[PDB]
UniProtKB/Swiss-Prot annotation, chain A:
Organism (species): Saccharomyces cerevisiae (strain ATCC 204508 / S288c) (Baker's yeast)
Subunit: The 26S proteasome is composed of a core protease, known as the 20S proteasome, capped at one or both ends by the 19S regulatory complex (RC). The RC is composed of at least 18 different subunits in two subcomplexes, the base and the lid, which form the portions proximal and distal to the 20S proteolytic core, respectively. Component of the lid subcomplex of the 19S RC.
Any one GO cellular component localisation term in the record: nucleus
Sites of Phosphoserine modification: S58
Note: Present with 51900 molecules/cell in log phase SD medium.
Protein name: 26S proteasome regulatory subunit RPN7
PROSITE patterns documented for this protein: PCI, TPR, TPR_REGION
Pfam families hit by this protein: PCI, RPN7, RPN7_PSMD6_C
Molecular functions per Gene Ontology: structural molecule activity
Compartments, record wording: Nucleus
UniProtKB/Swiss-Prot annotation, chain E:
Function statement: Acts as a regulatory subunit of the 26S proteasome which is involved in the ATP-dependent degradation of ubiquitinated proteins.
Keyword NAD attributed: no
Other noteworthy facts: Present with 16700 molecules/cell in log phase SD medium.
Originating organism: Saccharomyces cerevisiae (strain ATCC 204508 / S288c) (Baker's yeast)
Membrane-spanning ranges: none
InterPro entries: 26S_Psome_reg_C (IPR013586), CSN3 (IPR050756), PCI_dom (IPR000717), WH_DNA-bd_sf (IPR036390)
Extent of Basic and acidic residues compositional bias: 463-475
An MF annotation (GO) of this entry: enzyme regulator activity
PROSITE patterns, per the entry: PCI
Post-translational modifications: N-acetylated by NAT1.
Quaternary structure and partners: The 26S proteasome is composed of a core protease, known as the 20S proteasome, capped at one or both ends by the 19S regulatory complex (RC). The RC is composed of at least 18 different subunits in two subcomplexes, the base and the lid, which form the portions proximal and distal to the 20S proteolytic core, respectively.
Protein name as it appears in the record: 26S proteasome regulatory subunit RPN3
GO process annotations (BP): proteasome-mediated ubiquitin-dependent protein catabolic process; regulation of protein catabolic process; ubiquitin-dependent protein catabolic process
Pfam families linked: PCI, Rpn3_C
From Swiss-Prot, chain F:
Post-translational modification, as annotated: N-acetylated by NAT1.
Disulfide bonds: none
Primary role: Acts as a regulatory subunit of the 26S proteasome which is involved in the ATP-dependent degradation of ubiquitinated proteins.
Superkingdom assignment: Eukaryota
Name of the molecule in the record: 26S proteasome regulatory subunit RPN2
Lineage, opening ranks: Eukaryota, Fungi, Dikarya, Ascomycota, Saccharomycotina
Family: Belongs to the proteasome subunit S1 family.
Full-sequence portion shown in this chain: 4 to 74 of 945
Subunit text: Interacts with UBR1.
Miscellaneous remark of the record: Present with 4750 molecules/cell in log phase SD medium.
Curated annotation (Swiss-Prot), chain G:
Protein name: 26S proteasome complex subunit SEM1
Organism this protein belongs to: Saccharomyces cerevisiae (strain ATCC 204508 / S288c) (Baker's yeast)
Phenotype of null mutants: Impairs mRNA export and transcription elongation, and induces strong transcription-associated hyperrecombination phenotypes.
Residues that bear Phosphoserine: S12
GO molecular function: molecular adaptor activity; protein folding chaperone
Domain of life: Eukaryota
A biological-process GO annotation: maintenance of DNA trinucleotide repeats
Extra information: Present with 5590 molecules/cell in log phase SD medium.
């Protein structure tokens, strides 16, 4: 249960070469200890592939790059020997138990509990395919509705290990069927988070916030990642979705976050960023924003691909907030608050304005920054005509097809 | 002008619903018409025989 | 026997005639049809001259366009009968575009843009074209008002713009058939 | 302004404060976004029924 | 052995023959033989291809022949002679049978039945060649005959429908021959090809058959488009006779493609948008139609760039078209970011790929559109900006060079600005808020005219299948 | 073969070349109909004139062209 | 994929016996699928797949961050650079 994600989390951080020197070498230690002790032997061969062009590599049976920036990476032959031994052993033991459960009738509850143990071993060693097969026999013998739901979650978890978002998605359709058959609120919370993490793994965060702000209140955890880890993810999803008034309630005034405090780096930076967006201290906003890039977005698996998008958005919001409270600004005032140069400021605005969330122009000549307001009845007219343009396209499109019939 | 435009588009959707449904009934009445022909053969015949 | 020494020169001259009359519509159609006889088989060797000019006019570099004409008089084949006309074509195109841009340009700024060699020609051209120079400022707005006044003078006119009354009468009768 | 207790804009290039209490919202327009919304969902439901025709 | 196989192909055909045949000698029922003819072609391709290649000669002996058996022997002779079990009493299935014309009745006197069977036979020849993938001599020979055959006689309503497909095969083989290889001959036959179809369109107007007319226009239009004659296509389409009466959705897809393309080079992009957006949707959406569909997608984006509008980056990404839509993505990106240096490298690099799809002449014109996007950004981002700063940003030559670009551009309303000459800047004039203007009324009326079109379009078509279906007998 | 000379020849000045334009035009006009539909006034000019005796031929061209037109 | 919603027009149009002939006729006009040339010229394609993962090979929602690089690195330098100038002004 416990190494299955924790080894993957550190192993992802270790892969990157776009992390800090220090953070990669701390991770590397946790990964390596856990291969030898827990018998993560096949996923360890797998992980030598996953760098490749990224550095660190120093393996004895698998490729190396010219630049080893790590040495808490080693392949040993003892690892391979062990595999062979341990494999046969676990397999032999349980098998015989299964045959014994066949001789004297006991096989409904106990043979499925034996096959649950077989998929956990299979899962331990990093085989999604053969874990799933064993977890398949568990179903066929007739068991409680509770047990059946617990098993499907485990299988979907093996999807996260190889960081395959589609493998997660497909399995979690089946849980949606059984969830109301058991009718539990306990395994529904697990569902909320399981989904939480899956929605966080894909681009769109709108669903994520909703599931994960709830997952602060009541959490039940069977092969689901730590409560400080879940808190961090929730602050990210809050920021994205919500605006001032709402935001302030949800993720600053939660009793749950306020009792958990900050003690670790990741939680700390994310938390301080969130108060500064609300409180209009824009000075201290950019040091927190930069900390958020290194310590929060990138070592995370479910935000490595959404890190670029999240920071870019953040720059858009904070400047856009400022703009809502202004009709005119000066270039220097605006630049000073951020703690950048006027030249540099024009440059960052000039990527963001065409696409537009800022709703501003800059008069370079009078030395002001001017703010245009299309919010009136004009705004509401533009909203409707566009939504209507689509209805007209669809009506046309289906209609030509039936008129042809 | 604006509520007249929105209401004009709304009636287009109800009428195009009706468009499809006439076309679904035709498909079913086709099946019925084919079985009918075997039955009409016996009906034509009875009139010749008597 | 489907080409000549003369042909390559001939296509160069026809392409200039379309440009000089400002039938740009037929200039592109004709080039499409022309393409597969001159692609690399006669190639562009003399044909460069209306082609490059064209590239500069599409881009809107009236400057690069002027230079290709100016250097275009050193090499004579007989293209000077259409270069002289294309010199004029440019001025009118510039003249139309600058009405929108501004109301006024000093006399000196007009000479440089609209390509003259005498300040007295610049002033004469303006008078004939219906811009009064009063106080050494041109009034581009004059001609524009006069053209516009003329469109309102002729009548076709009530339906094309469409009255409020007319829009609402059209709705009710579409329904009621 | 951000709280929206007078929702105005401060113009810093003249130092003048405009207070705007104006409605920038109208009922018809908001209800219209929902009405259109409804029809888009309906037209997906219609499309399934026409699948038989194809 | 051989005989067995020949009897089976013949038997299979007889069935197919019956379907279309029984209807047409009742009286013409134009629409219904047409739909069957579409199914019939597909089954015949498999029939001909397998179980030897001498089945066509046999099928001929089974039906009546004045000169039909003779003509068919010459076709077969070329691809090595056949006449074994292909002569009466061993390719003869009649012998007092009435569907295939009673033998007594055939000997006895006059009135022809040659008409429909002759026409049908020709169709089978076309298909026979096309499966083989030999054109050359056989095609030239077959071509010569069938044209004076259709005009000897005067066609029926049904007989029109068979030539509307027949011509498609004569057109296409000749295009492939002409594009193989260049000769003095290649130029000669092009002339003949245009002459026959265009006269045949005159006839077909008066006979009342829409399907012959619809196919002919497509073919003729493709012909101008190939040979780069913009001038010939512009006249054809302005002296309209295209039907929207009875066509396939196949035919509307071809027509709308040729129209969009032609219009593009002659500097009208707006109506071309309507035509190409229309064409894709009318075309059947399938994996065997992927050739025609793939060509339309490439054109459409290229046409969006010509307007100065930008089609989706989303478009190139989620497609399963990605391989072929490899050049366009960069062509859009180059224009979107408004860097002219990128655009010059792109159109060089993909020069071979684009030339095939013949958007290459359009890529040259898009260089205008680059500049347009690049100054559009500058005006939107900085309202008031000196020409000096625009030179820095986009590497223009001088103050003047950019002045002229804007000046030309705002006549067309692209940048939508006004220049301040004396103060040395460009001051942008967009400011929105036209809910004070009377502007919504025109906009709204164009939407109400689309909604009115949809209203007319349902009303006519709905009852029409219903009235036929009620008329036909039912329980 | 292509209608472009036949257009040029009516516009060419000399009586003999104008008579020639008519004769070429009428022989192939079911290939070449479109283009001479546009250039119809020159054809009506020749009809008018009693300084040609191929005036009849020019009224004849106009009847073929119209047939192909749809008018 | 194609104009409009590509998903809305794929189910509107599917195979019938009438339709199958017309698919072949359309294909054969240009000839082939026109989708064999790109694999031959390049002899195994080499697309834009390196820049990020919202590139040409993408199967998830686009983030629109392939038209622009990561400016966060740049910003680390810009922030520090400002502090130093500011300090002695």
């Amino acid at each position: 249960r416990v190494p299955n994600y924790e080894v993957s989390e550190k192993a992802f951080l270790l892969t990157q070469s776009k992390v800090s020197i220090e953070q990669r070498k701390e991770a590397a230690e946790f990964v390596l200890a856990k291969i030898k002790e827990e018998e993560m032997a096949p996923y360890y061969k797998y992980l030598c592939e996953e760098y490749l062009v990224n550095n660190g590599q120093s393996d004895l049976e698998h490729d190396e790059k010219s630049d080893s920036l790590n040495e808490w990476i080693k392949f040993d032959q003892e690892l391979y020997n062990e595999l062979c031994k341990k494999n046969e052993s676990k397999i032999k033991e349980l098998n015989e138990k299964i045959q014994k459960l066949e001789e004297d009738d006991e096989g409904e509850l106990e043979q499925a509990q034996a096959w649950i143990n077989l998929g956990e071993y299979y899962a331990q060693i990093g085989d999604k395919d053969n874990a799933e097969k064993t977890l398949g026999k568990s179903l066929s013998k007739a068991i409680s509705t509770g047990a059946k739901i617990d098993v499907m979650l485990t299988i979907a978890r093996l999807g996260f290990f190889y960081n395959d978002q589609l493998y997660v998605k497909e399995k979690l359709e089946a849980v949606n069927s059984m969830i109301e058959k058991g009718g539990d609120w306990e395994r529904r919370n697990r569902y909320k988070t399981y989904y939480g993490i899956h929605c966080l793994a894909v681009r769109n965060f709108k669903e994520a916030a909703k599931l994960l702000v709830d997952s602060l209140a009541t959490f039940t955890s069977i092969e689901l990642t730590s409560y400080e880890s879940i808190a961090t993810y929730a602050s990210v999803t809050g920021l994205f979705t919500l605006e001032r008034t709402d935001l302030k309630s949800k993720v600053i005034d939660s009793p749950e976050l306020l009792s958990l405090i900050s003690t670790t780096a990741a939680l700390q930076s994310i938390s301080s960023l969130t108060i500064s967006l609300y409180a209009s201290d824009y000075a201290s906003y950019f040091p927190y924003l930069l900390e958020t890039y290194a310590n929060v977005l990138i070592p995370c698996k479910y935000l490595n691909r959404h890190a670029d998008f999240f920071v870019r958005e953040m720059r858009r919001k904070v400047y856009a907030q400022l703009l809502e409270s202004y009709k005119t600004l000066s270039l220097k005032s605006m630049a000073s608050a951020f703690g950048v140069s006027v030249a540099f400021l024009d440059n960052d605005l000039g990527k963001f304005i065409p696409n537009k969330q800022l709703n501003c122009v800059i008069d370079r000549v009078n030395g002001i920054v001017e703010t245009n307001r299309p919010d009136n009845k004009n705004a509401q007219y533009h909203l409707l005509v566009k939504q209507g343009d689509g209805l007209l396209t669809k009506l046309q499109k289906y209609g030509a097809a039936v008129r042809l019939t | 002008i604006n509520i007249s435009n929105n209401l004009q588009k709304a009636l287009t959707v109800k009428t195009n619903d009706e468009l499809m449904v006439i076309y679904i009934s035709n498909l079913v009445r086709s099946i019925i018409a084919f079985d009918d022909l075997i039955e009409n053969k016996i009906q034509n015949k009875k009139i010749q025989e008597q | 026997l489907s080409e000549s020494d003369k042909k390559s020169k001939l296509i160069s001259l026809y392409l200039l005639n379309l440009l000089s009359q400002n039938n740009t519509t037929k200039f592109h159609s004709e080039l499409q049809y022309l393409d597969k006889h001159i692609k690399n088989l006669e190639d562009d060797s003399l044909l460069s001259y209306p082609i490059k000019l064209d590239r500069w006019l599409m881009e809107g570099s009236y400057q690069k366009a002027w230079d290709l004409l100016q250097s275009g008089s050193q090499n004579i084949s007989e293209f000077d009968s259409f270069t002289d006309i294309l010199k004029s074509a440019i001025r009118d195109e510039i003249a139309k575009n600058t009405e929108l841009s501004y109301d006024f340009l000093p006399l000196s700024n007009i000479k440089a843009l609209l390509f003259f060699n005498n300040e007295k020609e610049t002033e004469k051209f303006a008078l004939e074209r219906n811009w009064p120079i009063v106080n050494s400022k041109v009034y581009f707005n004059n001609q524009s008002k006069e053209k516009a006044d003329y469109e309102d003078e002729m009548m076709h006119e009530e339906d094309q713009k469409t009255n409020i009354i007319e829009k609402a009468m059209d709705y009710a009768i579409s329904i009621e058939n | 302004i951000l709280d929206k207790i007078f929702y105005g804009v401060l113009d810093q290039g003249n130092g003048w404060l405009y207070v705007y209490e104006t409605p920038n919202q109208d009922a018809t327009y908001d209800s219209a976004l929902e009405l259109v919304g409804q029809l888009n969902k309906v037209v997906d439901q219609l499309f399934e029924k026409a699948s038989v025709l194809y | 052995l051989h005989h067995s196989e020949k009897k089976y192909a013949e038997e299979d055909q007889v069935q197919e023959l019956l379907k279309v045949l029984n209807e047409i000698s009742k009286t013409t029922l134009t629409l219904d033989p047409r739909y069957i003819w579409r199914s019939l072609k597909d089954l015949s391709s498999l029939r001909n291809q397998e179980l030897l290649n001498a089945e066509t000669l046999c099928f001929t002996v089974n039906v009546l022949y004045p000169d039909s058996s003779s003509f068919k022997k010459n076709l077969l002779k070329f691809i090595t002679s056949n006449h074994k079990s292909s002569v009466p009493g061993s390719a003869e299935l009649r012998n007092s049978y009435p569907a295939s014309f009673y033998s007594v009745n055939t000997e006895k006197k006059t009135i022809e039945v040659t008409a429909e069977i002759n026409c049908f036979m020709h169709l089978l020849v076309q298909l026979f060649l096309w499966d083989s993938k030999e054109l050359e001599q056989l095609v030239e020979f077959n071509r010569k005959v069938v044209i004076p055959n259709l005009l000897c006689y005067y066609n029926l309503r049904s007989l029109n429908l068979i030539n509307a497909k027949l011509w498609f095969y004569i057109y296409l083989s000749h295009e492939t021959l002409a594009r193989s290889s260049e000769e003095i001959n290649s130029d000669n036959q092009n002339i003949i090809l245009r002459s026959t179809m265009m006269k045949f369109l005159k006839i077909a107007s008066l006979k009342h058959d829409n399907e012959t007319k619809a196919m002919l226009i497509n073919l003729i239009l493709r012909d101008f488009l190939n040979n780069g004659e913009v001038d010939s296509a512009s006249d054809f389409i302005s002296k309209l006779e295209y039907p929207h009466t009875d066509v396939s959705s196949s035919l509307e897809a071809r027509y709308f493609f040729y129209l969009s393309k032609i219009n593009a080079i002659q500097l009208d992009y707006s109506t071309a948008n309507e035509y190409i957006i229309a064409a894709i949707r009318k075309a059947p959406h399938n994996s065997k139609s992927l050739g025609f569909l793939q060509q339309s997608n490439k054109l459409h984006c290229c046409i969006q760039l010509l307007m100065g509008d930008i089609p989706e980056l989303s478009f190139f990404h989620q497609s399963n078209m990605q391989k072929s839509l490899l050049p366009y993505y960069h062509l859009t990106k180059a224009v979107k970011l408004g860097d002219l240096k990128k655009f010059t490298s792109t159109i060089t690099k993909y020069k071979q790929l684009l030339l095939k799809d013949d958007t290459y002449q359009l890529c040259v014109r898009l260089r205008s559109n680059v500049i347009k996007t690049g100054i559009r950004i500058i005006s939107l981002t900085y309202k008031k900006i000196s020409l000096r700063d625009i030179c820095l940003k986009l590497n223009l030559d001088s103050e003047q060079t950019v002045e002229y670009m804007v000046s030309r551009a705002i006549r067309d309303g692209v940048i939508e600005a006004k220049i301040n000459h004396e103060d040395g800047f460009i001051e942008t004039t967009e400011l929105l808020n036209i809910y004070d203007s009377e502007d919504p009324q025109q906009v709204f009326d164009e939407r109400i005219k689309f909604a009115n079109q949809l209203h007319d379009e349902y009303l006519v078509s709905m009852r029409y299948p219903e009235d036929k279906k009620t008329q036909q007998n039912e329980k | 073969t292509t209608a472009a000379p036949l257009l040029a020849l009516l516009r060419e000045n000399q009586d003999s070349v104008k008579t020639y334009a008519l004769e070429s035009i009428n022989n192939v006009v079911d290939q070449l109909w479109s283009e001479i539909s546009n250039e119809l006034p020159d054809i009506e000019a020749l009809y008018d004139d009693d300084t040609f005796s191929d005036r009849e031929m020019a009224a004849l061209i106009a009847s073929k062209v119209y047939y192909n037109l749809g008018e | 994929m194609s104009t409009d919603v590509a998903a809305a027009q794929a189910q509107s149009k599917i195979d019938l016996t009438k339709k199958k002939n017309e698919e072949i006729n359309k294909k054969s006009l240009e000839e082939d699928d026109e989708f064999e040339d790109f694999p031959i010229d390049t002899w195994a394609n080499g697309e834009t797949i390196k820049s990020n993962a919202v590139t040409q090979t993408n199967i998830w929602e686009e983030n629109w961050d392939d038209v622009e690089v990561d400016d966060d690195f740049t910003n680390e330098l810009k922030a520090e650079l400002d502090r130093y100038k500011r300090e002695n002004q």
